[PDB]
Write an enzyme that holds these catalytic residues in place. Structure first.
Site, short mmCIF file in Angstrom:
data_model
loop_
_atom_site.label_atom_id
_atom_site.label_comp_id
_atom_site.label_asym_id
_atom_site.label_seq_id
_atom_site.Cartn_x
_atom_site.Cartn_y
_atom_site.Cartn_z
N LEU A 112 -8.58 -9.82 -7.82
CA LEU A 112 -8.93 -11.09 -7.41
C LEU A 112 -9.47 -10.95 -6.05
O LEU A 112 -11.36 -11.62 -5.59
CB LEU A 112 -7.99 -12.12 -7.56
CG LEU A 112 -8.05 -13.24 -8.88
CD1 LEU A 112 -7.97 -11.94 -10.16
CD2 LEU A 112 -7.50 -14.08 -8.85
N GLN A 113 -8.86 -10.61 -5.01
CA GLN A 113 -9.39 -10.76 -3.50
C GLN A 113 -10.10 -9.70 -3.51
O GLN A 113 -10.85 -10.01 -2.43
CB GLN A 113 -7.91 -10.70 -2.61
CG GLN A 113 -7.24 -8.70 -3.28
CD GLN A 113 -5.51 -9.15 -2.32
OE1 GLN A 113 -5.27 -8.32 -1.16
NE2 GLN A 113 -4.99 -9.04 -3.47
N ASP A 167 -9.10 -1.65 2.34
CA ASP A 167 -8.17 -1.37 3.72
C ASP A 167 -8.89 -1.56 5.22
O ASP A 167 -7.99 -1.07 6.16
CB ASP A 167 -7.33 0.26 2.77
CG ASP A 167 -6.92 -0.44 1.73
OD1 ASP A 167 -5.94 -1.50 1.85
OD2 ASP A 167 -6.53 0.69 1.00
N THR A 224 -14.37 0.47 2.23
CA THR A 224 -12.84 0.28 2.32
C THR A 224 -12.19 -0.85 3.10
O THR A 224 -12.55 -1.95 3.29
CB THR A 224 -12.19 0.86 3.57
OG1 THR A 224 -12.84 2.52 3.53
CG2 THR A 224 -10.71 1.55 2.79
N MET A 277 -3.22 -7.33 -0.83
CA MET A 277 -2.97 -5.60 -1.08
C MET A 277 -2.97 -5.78 0.33
O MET A 277 -2.79 -6.51 1.43
CB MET A 277 -4.79 -5.58 -1.45
CG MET A 277 -4.32 -5.49 -2.80
SD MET A 277 -6.42 -4.96 -3.69
CE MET A 277 -7.07 -3.51 -2.34
#
Ligand code: NA
Ligand code: NA
Lengths: 392, 392
Positions: B270-271, B134, B132, B180
């Protein structure tokens, strides 16, 4: 007439500080010809306002750091009497050398200073150091800074493509990456280095040199998503007809017209500041033009801009050449159409032959605690001398 | 019950393939316990549609390449009878091992498969591998993938900042970088690692955990541009009140309200695909959880997700632990408010202590002809067996 004045001009680059390093280090290697190297705080504005940075107070290490740190270590500006004030502050500080590191405008103004200097009875050898992320300067193979963005754009396109490709069956099938380049498509062209055959990314490259044919675009992308499963387009901010930011614009086009799930990114300043994936040959050349400008000035040459000459396409070979500032302005360097595919959305083999070597090699900067190490300069000012001065 | 099935789930990562490598390589190190490693084409959709990739036909080199190539090498999907069909195709192919590499949803479904497998009289050891960007999975220090984006965001923020700083006197004085993170601010928080004191970038970090107070924002930025000369804000797409893409939104805010020249970028995919500046500790951990899942399954353990345990904050030390899939779902991992400064626009020292080590070290991938080298898999399918099957 023994001190030197160095200044940056225009937008900064990931390696423009490498040039500054090349100029400063070699100047220090000739204490019997050049004294202190002064840097214009925030560009020539610095000379105009008499805010001169004494880079001699900087340790060898700090100066060495300049080659792996992006941006303009002394600052820059886009600023374009003034010429008279430049000579007044230069002579007041014993400045006989003027190293102007910038794009076309810079080169021209460097030349004029040279002209006035003579006229006023104060010769000052002025050598301009090339600098342009747009790669549109004449009389040079490539412009210092471009190689690095090219490498960044190509790498970024390759990485994002692998991503999209991974889930284009379920999720997003059209990815748009807006890059720099208003009148030139050199940057966008670098995106094509990601894929080498047909069917592989980037499927579409929007060049400002080619008028935007919406119908041709919409059908090429649609054709791609249902042939390769997805489609990635690298569009330069300069997408025009005879504009359109662009990324979201096109995204909207494909949505309302093809209904495909899209995604976009806008690198902006990221592409010109990504020293972490700079091009070795690029930072190599950024240093060289800086060293060569200080050398040309030692040899007694006048009003020249160093250049990069491709002494060999095959196994790419290059060296530094010279160019008359007097002619750098009012020439430029346009991207040759035989570099763009007939589809209008691709790069040609002749273009690859030119670019590929420019992004060769990696010059990763040293890393400290997870992040790239940066210069860290004192950037101290010399004690004023004149009696103030306003600008326009 | 000797072959194994590996599948990816959810959004891909720059290092999720590293996990795949860790799982595949160790499986090959136990031919007397595990046979062929099958990969689900495009995730479990692959198992559902019986499109199984025979990764045994892949050379050791290709498999090795997996650790330095972003995205999902076998593809992934966001897809969430079906459970019955999964066991039907698993047993038809002698699959006794199920390695599901994804976020929370994945872990839960991995567990259920385990339950049904028993119920149906077909035990299949299922071990989930954490994944993840996140960083919101529970029972683990960090989630594989986040460390890399964190490093990317911090580096990108540091580089863009040096740029803005270079010309904030003449040009743009406010730079916004949208990252994000919809409900979590872990990614945005990584941006703070760029600057360590007050006055240095990033000046403002918009966390989705903190409601957006326009007046407080507009005045903090304005306060920054005329105190430090400029202001860089890292805003997560999850900027909300009790939304707003975001970058241009805020940019408009500062323009119409403060009149400052702005600039923005949107990294998007991109990240999460920037394997070129991945975190060594991150790709190290991505591999480890993959190896540990195959080991736990060899030891005969069942229904677990490997974890990363911080055995030492000081001189950061970690190892792999275990967690019951049964509880991974319906827990999550929220960002602790005492990680956010009272200003609401900053990271706290407790947050740095947690993050900094996660982005430690560089794992640059090998480079070929200027670009990062990528896997290159055959990804051949095994010969069908069932009688077709539709999805939802
Ligand atoms: Na310029
Ligand atoms: Na997900």
């Amino acid at each position: 007439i023994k001190n030197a004045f160095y200044a940056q001009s225009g937008g900064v680059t990931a390696v423009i500080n490498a040039s500054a390093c090349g100029v400063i280090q070699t100047a220090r290697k000739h204490p019997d010809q050049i004294g202190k190297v002064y840097a214009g705080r925030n560009g020539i504005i610095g000379a105009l306002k008499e805010e001169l940075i004494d880079t001699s107070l900087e340790s060898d290490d700090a100066i060495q750091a300049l080659i792996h740190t992006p941006g303009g270590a002394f600052g820059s500006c886009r600023y374009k009497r003034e010429y008279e004030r430049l000579i007044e502050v230069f002579r007041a500080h014993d400045i006989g050398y003027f190293f102007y590191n910038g794009g076309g405008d810079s080169q021209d103004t460097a030349y004029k200073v040279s002209q006035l200097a003579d006229r006023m009875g104060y010769p000052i050898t002025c050598i301009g150091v090339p600098k342009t992320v747009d790669n549109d300067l004449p009389f040079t193979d490539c412009c210092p800074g471009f190689g690095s963005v090219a490498k960044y754009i190509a790498t970024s396109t390759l990485e994002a493509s692998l991503d999209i490709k991974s889930m284009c069956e379920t999720s997003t099938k059209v990815f748009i990456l807006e890059v720099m380049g208003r009148h030139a498509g050199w940057i966008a062209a670098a995106g094509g280095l990601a894929g080498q055959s047909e069917g592989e990314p980037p499927h579409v490259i929007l060049f400002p040199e080619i008028p935007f044919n919406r119908e041709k675009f919409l059908e090429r992308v649609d054709q791609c998503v249902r042939d390769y499963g997805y489609c990635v387009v690298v569009a330069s901010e300069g997408a025009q007809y005879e504009r359109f930011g662009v990324a979201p614009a096109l995204a909207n086009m494909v949505k309302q017209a093809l209904g495909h799930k899209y995604h976009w990114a806008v690198a902006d300043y990221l592409q010109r500041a990504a020293r972490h994936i700079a091009s070795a040959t690029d930072v190599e050349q950024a240093y060289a033009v800086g060293k060569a400008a200080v050398e040309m000035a030692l040899a007694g040459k006048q009003a020249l801009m160093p250049t990069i000459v491709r002494d060999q396409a095959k196994p790419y070979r290059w060296s530094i050449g010279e160019a008359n500032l007097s002619e750098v302005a009012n020439q430029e360097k346009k991207m040759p159409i035989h570099y763009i595919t007939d589809n209008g959305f691709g790069i040609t083999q002749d273009c690859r032959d030119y670019l590929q070597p420019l992004i060769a090699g990696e010059s990763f900067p040293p890393f400290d605690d997870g992040l790239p190490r940066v210069a860290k300069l004192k950037n101290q000012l010399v004690e004023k001398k004149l009696r103030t001065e306003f600008e326009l």
